[PDB]
Amino acid sequence: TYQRWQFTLPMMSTLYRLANQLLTDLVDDNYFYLFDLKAFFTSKALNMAIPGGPKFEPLVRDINLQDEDWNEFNDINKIIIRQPIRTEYKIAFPYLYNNLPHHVHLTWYHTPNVVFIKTEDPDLPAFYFDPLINPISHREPLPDDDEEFELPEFVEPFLKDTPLYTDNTANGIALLWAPRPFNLRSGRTRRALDIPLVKNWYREHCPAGQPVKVRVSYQKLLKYYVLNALKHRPPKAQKKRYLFRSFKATKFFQSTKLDWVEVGLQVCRQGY
Amino acid sequence: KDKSKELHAIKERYLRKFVFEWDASEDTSIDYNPLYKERHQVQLLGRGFIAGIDLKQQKREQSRFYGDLMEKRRTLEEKEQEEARLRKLRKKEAKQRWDDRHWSQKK
Amino acid sequence: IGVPIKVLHEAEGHIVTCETNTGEVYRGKLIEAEDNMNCQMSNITVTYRDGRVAQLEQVYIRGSKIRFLILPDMLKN
Amino acid sequence: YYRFNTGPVGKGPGCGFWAAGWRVWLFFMRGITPLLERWLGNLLARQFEGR
Amino acid sequence: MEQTLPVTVYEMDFLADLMDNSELIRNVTLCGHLHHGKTCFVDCLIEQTHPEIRKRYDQDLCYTDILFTEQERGVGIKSTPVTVVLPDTKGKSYLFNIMDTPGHVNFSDEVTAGLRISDGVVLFIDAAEGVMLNTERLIKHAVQERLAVTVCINKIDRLILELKLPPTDAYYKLRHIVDEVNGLISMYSTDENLILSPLLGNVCFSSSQYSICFTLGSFAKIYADTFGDINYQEFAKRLWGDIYFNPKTRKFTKKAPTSSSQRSFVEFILEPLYKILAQVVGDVDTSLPRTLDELGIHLTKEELKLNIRPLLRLVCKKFFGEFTGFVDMCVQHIPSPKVGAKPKIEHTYTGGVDSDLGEAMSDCDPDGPLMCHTTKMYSTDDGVQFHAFGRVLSGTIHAGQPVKVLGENYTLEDEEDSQICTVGRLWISVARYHIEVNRVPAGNWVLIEGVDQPIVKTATITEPRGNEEAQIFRPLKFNTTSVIKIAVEPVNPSELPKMLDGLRKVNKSYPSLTTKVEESGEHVILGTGELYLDCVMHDLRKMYSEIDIKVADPVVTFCETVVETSSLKCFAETPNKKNKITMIAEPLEKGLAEDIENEVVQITWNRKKLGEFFQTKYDWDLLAARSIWAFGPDATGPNILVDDTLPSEVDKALLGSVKDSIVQGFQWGTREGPLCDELIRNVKFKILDAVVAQEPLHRGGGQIIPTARRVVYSAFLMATPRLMEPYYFVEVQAPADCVSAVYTVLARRRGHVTQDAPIPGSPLYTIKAFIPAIDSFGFETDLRTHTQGQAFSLSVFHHWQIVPGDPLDKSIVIRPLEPQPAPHLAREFMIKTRRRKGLSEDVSISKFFDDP
Ligand SMILES: O=P(O)(O)O[C@H]1[C@@H](OP(=O)(O)O)[C@@H](OP(=O)(O)O)[C@@H](OP(=O)(O)O)[C@@H](OP(=O)(O)O)[C@H]1OP(=O)(O)O
Ligand SMILES: Nc1nc2c(ncn2[C@@H]2O[C@H](COP(=O)(O)OP(=O)(O)OP(=O)(O)O)[C@@H](O)[C@H]2O)c(=O)[nH]1
Ligand SMILES: [Mg+2]
């Protein structure tokens, strides 16, 4: 039935290496600060556009700031202006900068930087002081050696015999931070339709120095992604009836194994 | 012009046909802040790459800061090992090119 | 290591009573209890075999020469 | 295209990467199917229902 | 009791039995930097003591950070108390009252509140980042608050799985962290008795994600269990610190054999840990079964099918077991608190230890007077009723027993900030569930119901009909100053009372929040930072008051000072036309304001020592040094009041008759200020002359105080006045590359980069800089978005600095909605804040004189 799988770590590493070209090699979600579905939800609910983000119709009827009638509160002779309060600030702190924040979503704050040292040269030992690491500028009531403390004969470090690092240690460490599904080692099987390859491509920022048409392509792709994510509702409780199983149970149909191109020509002729 | 547009932003905040191409007026990200126009694309420690884009082009167009940092910090033996690895990669690149040469530069 | 021994160490910091092999009865705070039942105590009341009492600040009794100890009921649970 | 045509590769017709549009049109077909099935069923029937 | 409680290893009855014995109670505060593992460590302790509560595999259960805002944002917002019974490595159980505090720098008020009632501090330091801004600030705060301190180096698995450093260099990193901590402690404390070193047991090594925690003692105990003949205490004494192992002699030495042997630490502790982690992560399917068999660890087939991270957590949990190293640390190096009671009373209680009640409390016995001290107020989920969380320093709280509550303004003479109340129920607060009890003896933490009404921030609960000589514990002294200011109004004015109730409730909930009503009827809230104020606004708008509220744009609170002596000596007279005062104003010397604020000098001192300091340090004549009267708005303020009055011109007895009235007027004037009605900073007011009327009903009261304030205002205005801006100290933790981007963003906002250095052992850099508080708005988001999230910053108030422009300049012209250039920022800031406060349009140096 081809429903579930469980691979081995060397297989998973090799598949990751082959797929490298389709993956962004990101080890954190700090990249998506104010660029994830929650920030987009907040911007939509407030009818504001992130510079690189989509742009929807006002969820509510927008308050025209030419409508309020200059109370004592919003007097402009009292306001000290230093920097224009950009839309990013209002998405970042929806409750401190917005009046009437309705259907607004709070955004995950910082996450600690993942300081991972990608291993460029396989031949190197797994544990190795990479040049990227800043040097440690070197420089205690110890007992006296004359003391009679002696270890028994049996005693030695817990895993002396076992080697520190093996051939497939760096690979496993890298897989620990590989993106999904390359961080797994077992699971289920999906549909080629259900696997999108460039969703993570247009979820990222647009590369610098790109033409306006591709920039707008990015923005509209994000718009429809957000719309689907927001409008999603859970499916309903069906009874699991199968059309082709019913057909097979009938007597007007029979099964056979054919070449796909032959079936395609067959279907073209039948449709005509 | 930038200061005038900034003040304009402050003032404005406070006071049938089939088209197969999105209009250029729909574009967002048309900002006035340099911090938001040029946004310092990520340099993943000089060892991470954007998906899809050519690796050689990415290396060529990267800031080179991490290359300078590596040449500064690397020990002599580390530099020798890295140079040997780069030589191996260059040999692989040249062999791949020689195999996948165009017919205008073959025998 | 024995189950009763763990329960003894649990009584460290509590007021306990100790009878020796010679029947002198020492009541006070258990400071330290060793694995072999060696017992350091403080602010003791001692009741001799004749019935008379005395008061001591600091004592230490060897485990072997202890007949038994009474511990709080705070421990029983 | 704008990720395919970077570096040595220049503008041209040599980029075949069709999973994206293939998925788009399959998902459109998913929703269209019942509509056309219903239409053809109403048409090729012993009788006809309109209104 | 008999309430329903979750299944637990220990039993509530044993917990209550322990509660009576004060020698087995450990009051500890878990503090550290942001995201350094405190909450997950507490989660794991809770899991150890509650076999039913379990942390999700791919999601981390906290069991603190209970609030919805906390869960959504990912950052702890409020301190949480947890009372548990944890075993010792020896097997002896103790009672631990652990107050887990937030790590963010804005919420340091929670940490100070926890410190006030804690006896020990456990400082969590990340193994990769190292010592950071909040770690330094918290070390300073704890040593100044006179608490014993111990350290836990967390996230030691980053050295193995992220930086993949060699064992020796990981050891070097840990040693460097320890040296940094010791340096900071020595810098902030004169006494050297507090030295941190793992050999002594003051430092522990932990990885909360993978459930590892140990000291040298505990990891020697594991060796002892595997081979029975070792004294794990001596083994631990020898492990750490440049002690090389000789296996031929089976003996340790200070001298390295073979010039390639690793320290005993690397040989015995670090290396096997490296091996375990590497084998689990890289060779899970080839030789992991053999390695676990060697370790004696047997895991079921269902378990060994897990993914790498759950498998690591499970295997490490099975190997190490409980967190007994933490318990050993705390039990050894934190008072009883029978022992720690006396310093607590010496530092906090206002009546001093020498007092009879000081002795009665430093004894710390359940059978005595009641002297509870409540520092926190926790709101029920409905948000209606609050419960006072505090510690019992003497006596016993009984449910239903009437008590007397004293607020912060109560004095033994002004007996009107007290009120009799009745306590309804008592709780022993575990984080997500409250144990209800009937009583609580001294030396414990307790939640009290029914005493919330007569208190706002801090209170002391005593018994009525007794303790007639009872005085309040000192109000909390906060690590920083709340400067950011916002204004709040409702959307529908018909619902103002709801907003007022919400404002009161948030004032109670947030210890350092200051809510006030200006003269123009504007409700103002003061907070430390933008995230702080965002959380405050969320709670106000959603939890407490359920209305819609408009918020004004953020702005900071300025101060006023002078830069040169008054042009002429100013004077005034009472409406009675007697009681003439004559003053001058000048600027103070550099650092004197810092001394007064940091309490390097106290007015309570004997005039002998006070004049001694003033004469020896700041080059004053003893005549003036013994002529001090007041220290600004508070007893510790940055403005001084001297009386230069020579004895030949004014009867000193007569002057002393109105000393108190003149001091009151001076303090009020300094508190308000003439420029914009804000604090006056760094000014010396010198009473040059004082003609005092003869009769008390002609002087004092409603005659001198207004005249005193008017003279102070006139002298300050005559001296060249200036405004002072708050300045924030920013620390950015960026990659090796984005330093230039940080420079650019900071330069765009009047910033000044003080320093930029690498983090030893890590590929990152720390950039320390100074920013103006008023420009700091949106700075962190600017940085993060411009750098693509690779740079993160935390800012905190540092010092006051003079705004570049000259405020009292009427030549300048200001447009309503333009960012002004520097040379008249002072004028803009003065005029607009005057408008906000609702005062007149401009202030003239003659406004408060008697001549015009
Ligand atoms: O389809 P578009 O985005 O408008 O791209 C059209 C063109 O397409 P048409 O022939 O349908 O007009 C080519 O694209 P394809 O036909 O190959 O899809 C061509 O692309 P290549 O040069 O990469 O083959 C080029 O696109 P670009 O200029 O982005 O390379 C061009 O665009 P212009 O209309 O701007 O010339
Ligand atoms: N690598 C590693 N990460 C950890 C470890 N412990 C916690 N973390 C991560 O560190 C982040 C900080 O989470 P917490 O420790 O729960 O937060 P906190 O310590 O209470 O700090 P505050 O949020 O300010 O209260 C979490 O997202 C964890 O995933 C650890 O031992 N190793
Ligand atoms: Mg926390």
Side-chain angles (χ1 to χ4, degrees), chain A residues 213, chain B residues 21, chain D residues 1-2 5 11-13:
Chain A
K213 57 183 185 94
Chain B
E21 193 90 15
Chain D
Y1 271 15
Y2 270 92
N5 298 328
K11 63 165 49 182

Side-chain angles (χ1 to χ4, degrees), chain E residues 30 33 35-40 42 62 64-65 70 74-78 100-103:
Chain E
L30 304 199
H33 193 69
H35 283 318
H36 271 209
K38 311 169 271 282
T39 293
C40 196
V42 170
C62 289
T64 74
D65 312 356
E70 283 165 322
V75 295
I77 284 150
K78 291 229 169 67
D100 160 29
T101 66

Side-chain angles (χ1 to χ4, degrees), chain E residues 19 57 196 199 202 315 407 416 433 455 458 460 576 640 696 781:
Chain E
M19 261 165 48
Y57 287 149
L196 264 62
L199 292 140
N202 288 330
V315 156
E416 65 176 327
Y433 84 65
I455 74 191
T458 309
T460 177
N576 299 357
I640 177 167
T781 170

Side-chain angles (χ1 to χ4, degrees), chain D residues 4-5 7-10 12 18-19 21 25-27 30-32 34-35 38-43 46 48-50:
Chain D
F4 200 98
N5 298 328
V9 182
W18 48 267
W25 292 117
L26 283 171
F27 291 137
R30 142 181 185 202
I32 280 287
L35 173 47
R38 168 201 322 165
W39 182 71
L40 293 159
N42 280 349
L43 208 152
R46 208 85 269 176
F48 169 88
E49 210 298 297

Side-chain angles (χ1 to χ4, degrees), chain E residues 41-53:
Chain E
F41 194 89
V42 170
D43 152 33
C44 298
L45 291 167
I46 285 286
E47 285 177 72
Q48 302 273 324
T49 36
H50 287 339
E52 285 43 44
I53 299 160

